[model samples]
Structures are given as structure tokens and as C-alpha cells.
Target chain A: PDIELVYKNRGFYKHYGIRIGDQIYHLNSQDILTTAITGKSEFIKEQDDGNWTHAMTAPLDYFTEKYVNSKHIFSCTTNCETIARDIFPGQSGISQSKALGIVGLILLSASLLSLLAV
Target chain B: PDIELVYKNRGFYKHYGIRIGDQIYHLNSQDILTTAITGKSEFIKEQDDGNWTHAMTAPLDYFTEKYVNSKHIFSCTTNCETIARDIFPGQSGISQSKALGIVGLILLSASLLSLLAV
Candidate 1:
């Protein structure tokens, strides 16, 4: 017999809360060497074998806004931006926060933008 | 040599969006059987030889609003919610679009709320 069974919507699985543009970022080779312009030093590391993680989220804004001016994410190709478009087609709207980080990176480095394609 | 090189900010990766203050849902039996209030028929489906797919995204909202009311995800345990928070934690901000289908379900049942823990 043909039973009328439904998919029984499993609902959704919340991936992560990334600002549409704030989620992705890119960096270039030269940017890694430069020091904080104000001499206060914004980057921090855990230990010899530790990671350079930020204390808070807001500090990132200060560094990118004041010192870097968004020159950090240059890879030298349009590949990265292409990837963004591919993953999220133009039809679907992306969140603002996630878009911020990605667009900001693209603006800073055309080359680094290409890496995302990989 | 002790070259003081930086970590080379590789930029960031994009994560999905979810919601806050949205409690886990609980699901039980019996809700799946009821017919549409209007009796006009909204429970559509795909042919037997094929999978049941929705025509558009907006229709999803209608089904839940009109019939499901978020009771579709009843797994009978808080395991699901626990898993969501475990992966996302509380501090992070999730997107609203990603949160709707989730919250709608939890509001309908209590047992399904516990399904997230797993």
C-alpha cells in the first residue's frame, strides 16, 4: 500500500553565530612582520608553543581600523572572493557580521582573496 | 636564529548563525496525525519513486506556522540542545534566520528540547 509518509521536518541545525561579514578574513605575507604603530602592541601569545590569540573581540576592530587599514589579507587573486560567492550565492542574503570580515579582507588584499577559492 | 616573526594572520573562517535565549524543544507523538485546520490541504509531497522536496523556502514557514508549530523535531531527550550549546556555547551571537525553525519546534514540545544534549 502507498502510505503517505512525510519527511517529518527535522528542523534546522544551527551552525554558528558568525556576523555575515565578520567571520572570514585574509592576510598577506608582509603584514605579519609589522609592529603596532602606536608602540602599545596589540598582539599577544600564550607561550613559546602557544597561539597569538586576542584578549577580546573588540580589540580586533582597533587593530584593523587604526594600524592595518585592512592591508592584512592580500593573497593576489580573485579566487577567495569567488569562493565566497560560490558557497553563498547572490540569491541568499548573508549576515552583516560575517560579510564584514570577508569584505574587509578582500578590500585590503586582492591576492589573499584568491586563497579562499582553494 | 631567533627571528621574531608573527603568526601570519590567515584571516578567519565563516561559521553558521543561530539564536539566543531560544530554549531547546521537546517532541512527542500524536501531533503528526492531525489534519489541516482549513481542510484545504497543505501537506504536499513528492511522488513515490522520488524524494519529497519543498518547492520553496517560504512554504516551510507556512507548514510550521499552520500545522507543525515546531513539534516536528521531538526526539524525546535534551541531548540535542546540549549538543548545540556545547558546540556554540552561550557567548557567541547567532543569526536570526538560522534560529527560526529551531525555536518554533522547541515551543511546541518539551521532550524534544532535551534532544540537543546529545
Candidate 2:
């Protein structure tokens, strides 16, 4: 719970909420929430015995360094298919359509040339 | 869980853990941890419904402004006694000792002066 529980019970720390998809969880300690989201509970474990630097600076480091990079990995990849798959992996319409359109135009031109020759 | 669950389940996000007292809680999302510690679940809730501003910027604001100030309030006050209590609220030894030492020194000087007058 941490020190936040006192204020939380009193309604002071109610400025925000954390929702995972459609569900919301209420938490009272930054360290707790930090560990939960980052999967780095060691921050709090290390501090039980204590340092202000451990408490403040380390969490900031985690957010900026580890958390952001992990998030970047997901965001940059979620909408992307493999380059191989996107370009020519089996029979996806984009590549097939482009090939068909080019071949169709070439054949139609050849037919027009033959009609003129006749 | 969020995107972190996949990475977390794979052990990539296992560099640290969050502890409250001696107990550890493993979490996968930074927003989840932030809201838990700060008691601001709305940060996550707001974003579930989307904003880098709401998710990133707002949490920073809460941490720097609200969370830091609240922690400061407790840290600065935990070991402090009120001035009234420390100084004169009945019988704390530091203040009483100073008063008694001064009075005893003054009385000793006065008795020495009386003996000299004799």
C-alpha cells in the first residue's frame, strides 16, 4: 500500500487511474505500480533497506530507458508485416494485382497492334 | 498485462521487481505501476478510452508535482516534532536541561556574591 494509502483513503490522490484494456485497477504506491507495469519489482525490493536516489532516480531511468525502448519495439512493429511477406510471400492481392494489371495492359496493346495490322 | 505481458512472460522485463515491505509484485505496464503508486488510476483509464499527452506527459506532471510534494511532506515530517512540543510542551529534556543549567549557574554566582558581601 505504501504511504499513499493514507491519502488515497482520504481521496487526495484521485487524479488518475490505470486501465488495462477495459478494466481499471486502483493502486496506492508508485513503486508498486511501477513494478507491476515494468515487471521490475526489484526497485522496491532494493529500497526496503533505502536511498532517495534508488527511489527517485532509478525509476526515472527505468521509464526513460527500459520502458520507452520496449514500447518502441511494439509500436513500430504492430502494424507491420515482414518485408518478405509484404513484397511477395504467397498470393496477397497487392503484388498479384500489380502483376496482373501490367500483363493485362501489355496483352491489350498487342491485340490493338494486331487489329491495325489486319 | 498490456504489451508487456508478452515480453514479461518471455523474461525480458525481469531485470527488477517491485516490493512493498518484503513482498514483491511483478507487473508489466509502466502506466499500471505509475497509477498504483500515485493513486491516479485515471491516467490509465483515460488512455484506454488515447493520448501520449495523457499517458506520458500527464503522469510526469503528477509525479513531479503531486507525488513528489506528497512524499516530501511525509519525509520532512516523519522525524520532526512540533516547535511547541520540542520547546515547551511540558518536559522534554533538551529545553529543560538548558533552563536548569542556566538557573543553577545563576544561583551559584548569586551565592558566591552573598559570601563576598559577608
Candidate 3:
């Protein structure tokens, strides 16, 4: 609803549809479709309020260092292990397949070596 | 292996998974899962480094201002000539079909107009 609502109602930020796996989500501010850029985003509990916080799953220090809002405390924050299960949303079977493929490749390589020895 | 390897061995950074489209990746560094939110994130590149350095495709100015680490020099960085094709990596066929459905609505509108004409 972020980009569509903005375009129809606010028109504050320019919106473009970047296709990511069968859907388009808001990339501008107040984007409700918060997802991980890599596999998963991150979560932190607010120090003062105890509400949860989230960020894109990326190697970004700026989220803490630059955009460090008061509620989203950057330091002394322990990782919320509970949120890991809820981080990413779709198509994980493909990744499982990929991991399986890696295992298969390693097994295949080992098999090839045994055949060579024979 | 940015986050996983970092977690396994290096511990250079604290990595967490942010669930977006699908899959887990190395969030410590070198993440390749770039997708869209609010539809699309912005595109910029290193003024000096033209190896098609891709960011999160989100609304960001600091990628130009703050992380101006020379080769990724941020300025006059046009949106790239051949990259939007290579930009987002998944599930856009849905968007296209939606656009097609919008065309169906216009046809429905034409029918409404024809009924009025009749």
C-alpha cells in the first residue's frame, strides 16, 4: 500500500515498480512491504519502548550509525532471536533446492573421484 | 556467504536475516539479493567505478554523499545504460499480468461506453 497509496493520495515520492518475485512493493519512505534485500532483513527491539524495529538484510552500518533514531537504539541492543523465523517471506523452497544442489555437487565430485580411482 | 561465513568464522560484522522475497544470504557483506519495495529503489553508481555497482534500489542519497569511497565516487551517476534489465532478479511476470488486467478494465469501460452509445 505504500507506493500505490502515495501515488493516488500523497504524490510526495516518485514511485516505480521494481519487479521482485511476482510483486511490486514500495521503495519509498513508510514502505510497508519491509523485506530483506539479502534473504532477510534485521530486527531490533526498541530500548525505551520495547517495540520491534526492522531493517533490510544488508551490510549496512548506516542504518544504525546514520539513521539512528532514538527508539531504534543502535548499541547495546541484543539480537531478537524470535524474529528470525519471521524475517523472510517467500520462495524459500528454491533456496533449499540450491543448498541441496550444493550438497549434490559435492557428492557428485566425490563420486567422480572414486570412479577415477577404479 | 557474507553473513553465514562471517558468523561461522570471521565475525567481522553482526549479520541478521531480513525476510524479503526468499532465500538467506550473507548479510555481513557482499549480498546479491536486490529487489523492489514501494515498487523500486533508486539507482546510482560509482562515478569512477563503472563495474555496475548496484545498491538496494531504494530511496537513498547517502550512497552518493556519504559512501563516496572514491572508486564508488557518487555524483553525476546516471541510472546506468544496460542495468534495469539486470536490476531486480525475480517475479515480475505478475506485474505484467496485472497491467494486462488493467487493459481488460479499459475494455470494460469501452463496453460501458458502447452500451451508453446504444
Best by TM-score: 1
Q: Which stretches of candidate 3 lie over 4 Å from their true place?
A: A1-118, B1-10, B14-57, B72-118
Residue range A16-114, candidate 3, lDDT tens digits: 221222232222223211221111222222223222112123322322232221111111124332221222233254342232222222212222111
Which digits, one per residue and each the tens of the lDDT, describe model 1 over residues B1-118? 1111011111221111112223212222222112111111111111232222112222223323322321222232223434334223463464332333343332221111111111
Candidate scoring better on DockQ of 1 and 2: 1
Error of 1 at A52 (Å): 5.6
Residue-pair clashes, model 3: 25
lDDT of 2 by residue, A49-98 (tens): 11111112122223222112211101111222232132234645644334
List, residue by residue over A12-76, the lDDT tens digit for candidate 1. Answer: 21111112232222232233112111111121111122212222233233323322232222232
- In candidate 2, what are the lDDT values of residues B1-66, reduced to their tens digit? 011100112222221121222222122234322222332111001112111111121222232221
Error of model 3, residue B70, in angstroms = 1.4
What lDDT is reached at residue B38 by model 1?
A: 13
Residue A97 of model 1 has an lDDT of 36
- Candidates by TM-score, descending order: 1, 3, 2
For model 1, what is the alpha-carbon lDDT of residue B103? 35
